Antibody, heavy 217, light 213 residues
Framework: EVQLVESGGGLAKPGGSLRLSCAASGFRFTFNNYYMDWVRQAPGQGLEWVSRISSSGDPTWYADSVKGRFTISRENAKNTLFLQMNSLRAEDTAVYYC?????????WGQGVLVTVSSASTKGPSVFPLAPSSKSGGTAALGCLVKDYFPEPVTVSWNSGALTSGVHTFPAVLQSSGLYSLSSVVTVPSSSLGTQTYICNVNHKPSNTKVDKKVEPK | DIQMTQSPSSLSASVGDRVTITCRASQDIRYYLNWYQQKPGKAPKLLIYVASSLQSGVPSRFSGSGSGTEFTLTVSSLQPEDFATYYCLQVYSTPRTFGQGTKVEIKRTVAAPSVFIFPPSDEQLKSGTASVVCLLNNFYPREAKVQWKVDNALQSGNSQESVTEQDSKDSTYSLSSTLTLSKADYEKHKVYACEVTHQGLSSPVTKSFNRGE
């Protein structure tokens, strides 16, 4: 398998710049033999090809969408691929895949989110959704991860010990311009004894971590 | 620009069913076309390349067909884990053009949701905002009307929803509805209810609570 791991980019005000990187590994021949690509996907939409680069670094192809402002590059000595994104624009808000599209060596990175906005970073508040008449023979409890920017946050429960019955909801954008989501888990009623349920919220863009014990009502 | 027409934009089919997705190109691209599966929250993953070649590791359920201007992707026997958006991609010339996607949902017998309700927390009130969460759990189909009522007046424009992906083993959805007020207005009313209409329910199920009891 080719493996591609992206780095960069994050939150950026309109007009600003970011840079994506990507490390590659696993090609049969050496990195410098493979043409390479970036693809992107905006929230709500499908895939849009962004740019391509040849083996050496030349030539390069761009989508009209991004020609002029973005530049693709390569460092073969280091098995790394870059995307310099200048003159950022709201429309550029997407998940960006490093992609290897060479037939027989296809791979896509996991993606890295880029947010073009004038709103600034903000760490969430995490209020518990208390088990209660969240109940029959079963109990539901959760975490309200509220008012944060940009995406993402991650939620784990008791530090990955408890994955059974967990549903973390996609984030929604509030009319305030900030996001919110809930995370929830259904656990055996009688266990609320007795058993501690801490959820772990993490917001890399605010360098925040909260851990919080939910508890009965 | 080689234009790509993917069809259907979306479909619903049962476990075990034959599904067949179609891409059409505006030029002859010979056999240079690939198909990708994109699972929720994940990057696209190669299913078929050069039109009919199976990537190593992909279930044999998936096959690829055609050439020139007309290509078809078939799933032999659709499995619960096949909920995805599927995408063709022309690999013949740049710019690269993808099809607009086909959303595929698994269809299964009707399952009425379970409705849970969660009042705001003291910590959140200590701060002047109140947020009520309504949770429908494991239902099919996806379609559900979820209405908020405070003191039995129906709410409109002060709440929002989120749905999860179709669960990949048992093919159901869960949904959250979150109504949001100020301490100010939360304190003026006694009863909060959410009201759920769904095909698996012979009648609207309301779950409620009176403030602070």
């Amino acid at each position: 398998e080719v493996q591609l791991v992206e780095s960069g980019g994050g939150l950026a005000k309109p007009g600003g710049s970011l840079r994506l990187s990507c490390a590659a590994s696993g090609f049969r021949f050496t990195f410098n033999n493979y043409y390479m690509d970036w693809v992107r996907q905006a929230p709500g939409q499908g895939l849009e090809w962004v740019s391509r680069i040849s083996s050496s670094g030349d030539p390069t192809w761009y989508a009209d969408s991004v020609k002029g402002r973005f530049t693709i590059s390569r460092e073969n000595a280091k098995n790394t691929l870059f995307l310099q994104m200048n003159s950022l624009r709201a429309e550029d808000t997407a998940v960006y895949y490093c992609a290897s599209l060479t037939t027989g060596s296809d791979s896509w990175g996991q993606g890295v989110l880029v947010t073009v906005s004038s709103a600034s970073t903000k760490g969430p508040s995490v209020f518990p959704l208390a088990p209660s008449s969240k109940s029959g023979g079963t109990a539901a409890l959760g975490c309200l991860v509220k008012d944060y920017f940009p995406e993402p946050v991650t939620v784990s429960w008791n530090s990955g010990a408890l994955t059974s019955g967990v549903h973390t909801f996609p984030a929604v954008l509030q009319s305030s311009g900030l996001y919110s989501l809930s995370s929830v888990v259904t656990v055996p009623s009688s266990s609320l004894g007795t058993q501690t349920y801490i959820c772990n919220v993490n917001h890399k863009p605010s360098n925040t971590k909260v851990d919080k014990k939910v508890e009965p009502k | 620009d080689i234009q790509m027409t993917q069809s259907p934009s979306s479909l619903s089919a049962s476990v075990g069913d034959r599904v067949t997705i179609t891409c059409r190109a505006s030029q002859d691209i010979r056999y240079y076309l690939n198909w990708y599966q994109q699972k929720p929250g994940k990057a696209p993953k190669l299913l078929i390349y050069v039109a009919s070649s199976l990537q190593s590791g992909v279930p044999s359920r998936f096959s690829g067909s055609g050439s020139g201007t007309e290509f078809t992707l078939t799933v032999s026997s659709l499995q619960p884990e096949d909920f995805a958006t599927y995408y063709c991609l022309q690999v013949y010339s740049t710019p690269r053009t993808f099809g607009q996607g086909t959303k595929v949902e698994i269809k299964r017998t009707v399952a009425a949701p379970s409705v849970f309700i969660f009042p705001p927390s003291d910590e959140q009130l200590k701060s002047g905002t109140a947020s009520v969460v309504c949770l429908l759990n494991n239902f099919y189909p996806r379609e559900a009307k979820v209405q908020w009522k405070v003191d039995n007046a129906l709410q409109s424009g002060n709440s929002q929803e989120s749905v999860t992906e179709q669960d990949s083993k048992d093919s159901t959805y869960s949904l959250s509805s979150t109504l949001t007020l100020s301490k100010a207005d939360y304190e003026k009313h006694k009863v909060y209810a959410c009201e759920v209409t769904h095909q698996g329910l012979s009648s609207p199920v309301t779950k409620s609570f009176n403030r602070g009891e």
